[PDB]
Design an enzyme around this catalytic site. Structure first.
Site, short mmCIF file in Angstrom:
data_model
loop_
_atom_site.label_atom_id
_atom_site.label_comp_id
_atom_site.label_asym_id
_atom_site.label_seq_id
_atom_site.Cartn_x
_atom_site.Cartn_y
_atom_site.Cartn_z
N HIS A 180 0.85 -1.02 -0.21
CA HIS A 180 -0.02 0.06 -0.07
C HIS A 180 0.83 1.19 0.02
O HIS A 180 1.50 1.49 0.88
CB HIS A 180 -0.98 0.01 1.31
CG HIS A 180 -2.02 -1.08 1.19
ND1 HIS A 180 -2.42 -1.55 2.36
CD2 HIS A 180 -2.73 -1.54 0.25
CE1 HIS A 180 -3.43 -2.50 1.77
NE2 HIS A 180 -3.53 -2.45 0.65
N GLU B 73 2.05 4.09 2.72
CA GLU B 73 2.33 3.75 4.12
C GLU B 73 4.01 3.74 4.04
O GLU B 73 4.61 2.79 4.25
CB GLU B 73 1.78 2.11 4.36
CG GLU B 73 0.30 2.15 4.28
CD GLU B 73 -0.14 0.74 4.49
OE1 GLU B 73 0.48 -0.46 4.56
OE2 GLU B 73 -1.38 0.80 4.28
N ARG C 111 -2.88 4.73 -2.62
CA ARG C 111 -3.00 3.16 -1.71
C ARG C 111 -2.75 1.99 -2.71
O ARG C 111 -2.12 1.13 -2.58
CB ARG C 111 -3.80 3.16 -0.46
CG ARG C 111 -5.27 2.78 -1.01
CD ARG C 111 -6.20 2.48 0.05
NE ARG C 111 -5.60 1.62 1.35
CZ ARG C 111 -6.05 0.66 1.35
NH1 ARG C 111 -6.74 -0.03 0.39
NH2 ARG C 111 -5.48 -0.11 2.43
N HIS D 226 2.96 -3.50 6.87
CA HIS D 226 1.83 -2.10 6.52
C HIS D 226 2.13 -1.09 7.53
O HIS D 226 2.65 -1.37 8.61
CB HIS D 226 0.53 -2.88 6.43
CG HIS D 226 0.13 -3.86 5.48
ND1 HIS D 226 -0.67 -3.28 4.41
CD2 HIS D 226 0.52 -4.97 5.01
CE1 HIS D 226 -0.75 -4.30 3.53
NE2 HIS D 226 -0.08 -5.40 4.06
N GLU E 284 1.30 -4.08 11.36
CA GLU E 284 0.92 -2.81 10.95
C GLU E 284 1.67 -1.91 11.79
O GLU E 284 1.63 -2.00 13.02
CB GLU E 284 -0.64 -2.58 11.50
CG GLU E 284 -1.54 -3.41 10.46
CD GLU E 284 -1.59 -2.70 9.10
OE1 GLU E 284 -1.21 -1.53 8.81
OE2 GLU E 284 -2.41 -3.26 8.15
O1 LIG Z 1 -7.70 -2.86 5.13
C1 LIG Z 1 -6.67 -3.46 4.90
O2 LIG Z 1 -6.10 -3.45 3.73
C2 LIG Z 1 -5.74 -4.00 5.88
C3 LIG Z 1 -6.46 -4.94 6.91
C4 LIG Z 1 -5.67 -6.16 6.46
C5 LIG Z 1 -4.28 -6.73 7.26
C6 LIG Z 1 -3.79 -7.60 6.74
C7 LIG Z 1 -4.33 -8.70 5.80
C8 LIG Z 1 -5.31 -8.43 5.18
C9 LIG Z 1 -6.02 -7.19 5.33
C10 LIG Z 1 -4.96 -2.87 6.69
N1 LIG Z 1 -3.86 -2.09 5.75
O3 LIG Z 1 -2.68 -2.04 6.10
O4 LIG Z 1 -4.52 -1.07 5.18
ZN LIG Z 2 -1.59 -1.56 4.25
#
Ligand SMILES: O=C(O)[C@H](Cc1ccccc1)C[N+](=O)[O-]
Ligand SMILES: [Zn+2]
Length: 307
Positions: free
Chosen positions: A69, A72, A127, A196, A270
């Protein structure tokens, strides 16, 4: 600038600066690090993976992807720091030296280079990928909803204009297919870590279903131990658990896919923070973030070599 020691780790970088860094690190550490081109992005930018290896042989391996993404920024910044740290601690830290003496690490610092370039030139909060079809005026797919693991299920959007758009079919995004091909070709990955931001979480599968994975108890405790290690440096507090129990349903995700390929130690980080600055994390937080996150990642790697 001209060496990995004059490179400024405490500032955010452009795509070209990160790509240059890779070439410099390979030049400086030719016995440890090589640069692999696993594909080209939708817009034709090379997609690069740094291989850290002391030899072999299809050695058991650790995958780490950052910046899937694009907004980030802490993740790509942390990836650069990680790459340097591997070359620093190999030969120095006995635990890490032992990991690299028997295992390879594959590090993908900029998993979505088109998005990253776009967060620099047009839209800091972009993103998705930058793929375009005549089917819609809207651009890009959420590359972390594009994987063949519960693809198209609740937890992603079927609308091309959505920020969580899954794409038309699994692996439609070359940025995802390039990883899938690489990991499938290899066949001997033991861990798969997707990095992330933000929210300070350490997550294991699944996102697409409430079904417990058969490694739940183990990964939950590996996660607890990694969170403790991370917290130990600066006090940064993480929550942990499965994607679905901790956030909510999310489908077509990378670690759900990796876990389903038999890659047991599949986790998503995260990173900082919990919303004070959000995506716009201050540059002064890059090095402390990378440092503490390293402690967490190392904890996971140690569990991989010893298992
Ligand atoms: O909403 C999302 O795309 C993420 C939640 C997520 C985190 C790990 C695997 C799948 C989804 C968080 N992401 O950093 O934006
Ligand atoms: Zn992400």
């Amino acid at each position: 600038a001209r060496s990995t020691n004059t490179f400024n780790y405490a500032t955010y970088h452009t795509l070209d600066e990160i790509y240059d860094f890779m070439d410099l690190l390979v030049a400086e550490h030719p016995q440890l690090v090589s640069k692999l081109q696993i594909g080209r992005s939708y817009e034709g930018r090379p997609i690069y993976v740094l291989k850290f290896s002391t030899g072999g042989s299809n050695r058991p391996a650790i995958w780490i992807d950052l910046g899937i993404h694009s907004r980030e920024w802490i993740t790509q910044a942390t990836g650069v720091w990680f790459a340097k740290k591997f070359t620093e601690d190999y030969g120095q830290d006995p635990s890490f030296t032992a990991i690299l003496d028997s295992m390879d690490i594959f590090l993908e610092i900029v998993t979505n280079p088109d998005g990253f370039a776009f967060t620099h030139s047009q839209n800091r909060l972009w993103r998705k990928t930058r793929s375009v079809t005549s089917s819609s005026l809207c651009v890009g797919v959420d590359a972390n909803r594009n994987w063949d693991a519960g693809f198209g299920k609740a937890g992603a959007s079927s609308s091309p204009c959505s920020e969580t758009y899954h794409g038309k079919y699994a692996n439609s995004e070359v940025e995802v297919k390039s990883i899938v091909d690489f990991v499938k070709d290899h066949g001997n990955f033991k861990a798969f870590l997707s990095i992330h931001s933000y929210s300070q979480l350490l997550l294991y599968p699944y996102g697409y279903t409430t079904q417990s994975i058969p490694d739940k108890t183990e990964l939950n405790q590996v996660a607890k131990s990694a969170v403790a290690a991370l917290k130990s440096l600066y006090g940064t507090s993480y929550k942990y658990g499965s994607i679905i129990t901790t956030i909510y349903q999310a489908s077509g995700g990378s670690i759900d896919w990796s876990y389903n390929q038999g890659i047991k130690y599949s986790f998503t980080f995260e990173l900082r923070d919990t919303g004070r600055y959000g995506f716009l994390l201050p540059a002064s937080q890059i090095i402390p973030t990378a440092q503490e996150t390293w402690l967490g990642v190392l904890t996971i790697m140690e569990h991989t070599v010893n298992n």
